[PDB]
Amino acid sequence: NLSFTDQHIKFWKKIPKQKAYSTVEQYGQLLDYGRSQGAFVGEGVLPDTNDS
Amino acid sequence: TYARKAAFVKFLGTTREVTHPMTLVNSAFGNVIARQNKDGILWMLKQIEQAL
Amino acid sequence: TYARKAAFVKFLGTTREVTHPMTLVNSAFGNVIARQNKDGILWMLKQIEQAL
């Protein structure tokens, strides 16, 4: 044999493998913990709301 | 031939109020909170029945 | 020579809220309330770190 063999494959044996159950695979990401809108409010004042 | 369909949930409600002195006076027809609850339940029943 | 100085305590805060139906439906990633609390705490930590 003058060509490569099994031991020359590196990335295919290193990437983790997971089982698929459909032709479309979905996943969810978290991007932010909230909007940057200022944290100081004052004495006895209800602070504003925020959303991630 | 096949198809896919979706249905959307909606919301119904009502609010009842009783003043503090009214809860302290004597009542000729039993407790008033129970009467208010019964009236609210029956009103909601009628609204649901006609909305159906 | 001597001098006297003063410092004024400041206030920080934020508000988070979740609708009632959101707590009644199935959740993909666990309890929504705990996730929102963690997000708010981390956002507050970052805001304090940058304000320092």
Partner: peptide, 29 residues
Amino acid sequence: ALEAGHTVNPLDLEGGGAFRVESLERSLH
């Protein structure tokens, strides 16, 4: 020819696409 042609919108599924439950990971990233 029953097949699943990479359709994402649930209201546009046709043929073999309707015989498909969603595959969603249960760990947030």
